Every structure is written in C-alpha cells, then in structure tokens.
C-alpha cells in the first residue's frame, strides 16, 4: 500500500492511500469517500492520457507518490 | 495582498473573484447559434490566483453536447490539455437556459457541488436569455454542500429540501470589473 497524489485544476492536491492492484474505479470511489465527488463526474489523467475505469494503477505503471490529475465533467440543465 | 470581503454561512473566508463585466455578454454572443436552435451550452471560467484574489481571464467553451434542457462536456481530456498547458485554474462555470427562468436546477446543483468542494469560491453563472435575466450562484456552505453530497434521489431533475443555494455576494465575493477576457472555443464545428 502506497500514497498517490491527485492534483486538481483548482490548486488542491488530494492524497490517497492505494495499492497497485486498485482499479481506476476503486480510486474514484476513494475520492468520493474522502472528497464527496461522485465517480461519474471524475476523469483521471496520468502522463497525458485519461485512465480507463476497468484497468489498474499498475497497468498504467502508476507507482508511489505519483501524481494523477483530476478534471471534472460538466453537466448543466 | 488582497483582503477578504465575503464569507460562507459557516464563517469561512471567500477570496474575491474578479469577473470581466463583458463575460456574460460575450458568452451569449459565442453560443448564440446553439441558443437559436434551442440548445443549452456551457463554458468554464478560467483564471489565476494573484496576491490572495482570483482573476477570471479566460472563457473556455469545451467540446460538448446538448438538448433544450441539458448540456454536458464530452471530452474533458481536451479541456485538461488546455488548462494544464496554459496553467489556468478552474474558477467556476457558466451555462444557458435558452427558454427557462434563471435558477439552479437539480443537475446544476449536483455539478456545482463538486466544483465548490474543490474550490470554496467556485461560482455558477446562469444566463436566461429569453427572460433577459442572469444570476451568479453558489451552494450554501456547509449546509447546501452537505445536502447535495448526501443526496441519492432518482431522476435527472429532482427537487431538494429547503434552500440549498444562494446568489453570491457582490462585490464582496464576485466583483465585476473592466478587465481583459480571452475566449477559447474548443469545439470542432
Ligand atoms: Cl488562450
Ligand atoms: Zn441550469
Ligand atoms: Zn439531488
Ligand atoms: Zn490564454
């Protein structure tokens, strides 16, 4: 189990405790638990690409103290 | 160093956001073709933090889709590429209600909650051009944010108990000024 960082576009960095086997959806769930953002609003980006829900941190070779980036979807009505 | 002129309901300080007074009009101009076709359009308010205040400097129109009643981004990676490479903060968002009154809908509140959790000062501008009205809104903090975070009600549009949101304080939270504005429309047609 390791720390990773999620940097927002608002000057905030979220620190998470994860494992390399955690899927991206698990990561989004952790963000919901800690920060209150529904997973369906989250888009995570690492090394220039958007991460797919089904795949794992280790798949994208995300290691410890790596920084992912959070961009929110926008939905209006 | 700029000072604090506004507070949340819980007493937390809100840094000033300086909003170009032309932004609202420019947004309506830029999205006029959609408004004419009775389609909503959204935009991101982007800017910088300088000496304890925020400055909105860019209006970004992201890749998106819409109906008469909804709008939504479809390529956030594209939006991220712009904000990341230009180093611009997300300070809030704007959208049209082409035919409706000026208010924050269920979708608006669920969306804005996340932006405001990530930046306490985050604002939502709503344009209602058929009414010639507009508003700048935020959720009540902490109570409104708490309600929306806890909400699991079904329906794309559902009501919420009591007051969840408010108009922002002006000029204390948002002050409209004569300042530079760049438009960045990322759409491909
Ligand atoms: Cl630009
Ligand atoms: Zn709306
Ligand atoms: Zn709700
Ligand atoms: Zn620029």
- Count of domains forming chain B: 1
Three-class DSSP category at B90: strand
Distance from C-alpha of A23 to C-alpha of A56, rounded to nearest angstrom: 4
φ/ψ of B3, rounded to 5, equals: -105, 170
For residue B73, list chain A residues with Cβ-Cβ distance below 8 A.
73-75
Structure tokens that stand for B143 in this block:
């109570």
Residues of A in contact with B118 (CB under 8 A): 8, 10, 12, 35, 37, 70, 72
CA distance B181 to A54: 40
Q: Does B136 touch chain A (CB under 8 A)?
A: no
Domain containing B179 equals 1-189
Query: B40: phi > 0 → left, psi -120 to 50 → alpha, else beta; which?
Result: beta
Residues near ion ligand 3 (Cβ under 5 Å): B 151, 153
Percent of chain A as helix, strand, coil, to the nearest 5:
25, 40, 40
Between CA B92 and CA B88 the distance in angstroms is 12
Query: Hey, what domains does chain A have and what are their CATH numbers?
Result: 1-77 (3.10.20.90)
CA distances from A6 to A15, A27, A40, A67, B46 (A): 6, 10, 16, 6, 20
Q: Please name the residues in contact with B97: beta carbons below 8 A apart, sequence gap of 6 or more.
A: B40, B103, B126, B127, B128, B129
Q: Residue A37 burial by CB count (10 A; 0-12/13-18/19+): exposed, middle or buried?
A: buried
CB B100 within 8 A of CB B129: no
Which residue in the set A49, A50, A76 is minimally distant from B107, CB to CB?
Answer: A76
Q: What is the resolution of this structure in A?
A: 1.6
Q: How far is the CA of B75 from the centre of ligand 2 (A)?
A: 20
Residue B97 is assigned to a ligand binding site: yes
Q: What is the rounded distance in angstroms from the CA atom of residue B53 to the CA atom of residue A14?
A: 22
Which CATH number belongs to the domain containing residue B129 in this structure?
3.40.140.10
From ligand 4's centre to the CA of B184, what distance in Å?
8
Is B99 within 8 Å of B35 (Cβ atoms)? no
Q: What is the DSSP letter of A23?
A: B
Q: Provide, as residue numbers in chain A, all residues whose Cβ is less than 8 Å from the Cβ of B52.
A: none
Q: CB burial class (10 A; 0-12, 13-18, 19+) of residue B120?
A: middle
Q: How far apart are CA B88 and CA B82, in angstroms?
A: 8
- Structural tokens at position B131: 């009414």
């Amino acid at each position: 189990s390791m720390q990773i960082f999620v940097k927002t576009l608002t000057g905030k960095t979220i620190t998470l405790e994860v494992e390399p086997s955690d899927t991206i959806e698990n990561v989004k769930a952790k963000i919901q638990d800690k920060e209150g953002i529904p997973p369906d609003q989250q888009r995570l980006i690492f090394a220039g690409k958007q991460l797919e829900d089904g795949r794992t941190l280790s798949d994208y070779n995300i290691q410890k103290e790596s920084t992912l980036h959070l961009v929110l979807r926008l939905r209006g009505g | 160093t700029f000072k604090i002129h506004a507070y949340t309901e819980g007493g937390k300080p809100l840094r000033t956001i300086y909003l170009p007074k032309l932004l609202k009009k420019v947004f309506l101009d830029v999205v006029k073709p959609n408004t004419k076709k009775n389609l909503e359009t959204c935009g991101i308010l982007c800017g910088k933090l300088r000496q304890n205040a925020f400055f909105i400097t860019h209006l970004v129109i992201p890749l998106q889709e819409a109906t008469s009643d909804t709008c939504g981004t479809t390529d956030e990676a594209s939006l991220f590429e712009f904000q990341d490479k230009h180093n611009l903060l997300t300070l809030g968002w704007i959208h049209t209600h082409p035919t409706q009154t000026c208010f924050m809908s269920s979708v608006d509140l669920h969306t804005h909650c996340s932006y405001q959790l990530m930046l306490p000062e985050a604002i939502a501008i709503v344009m209602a051009p058929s009414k010639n009205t507009s508003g700048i809104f935020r959720l009540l903090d902490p109570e409104g944010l708490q309600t929306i975070v806890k909400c699991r009600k079904p329906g794309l549009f559902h009501p919420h108990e009591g007051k969840v949101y408010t108009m922002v304080a002006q000029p204390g939270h948002v002050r409209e000024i004569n300042s530079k504005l760049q438009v960045v429309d990322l759409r491909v047609k």
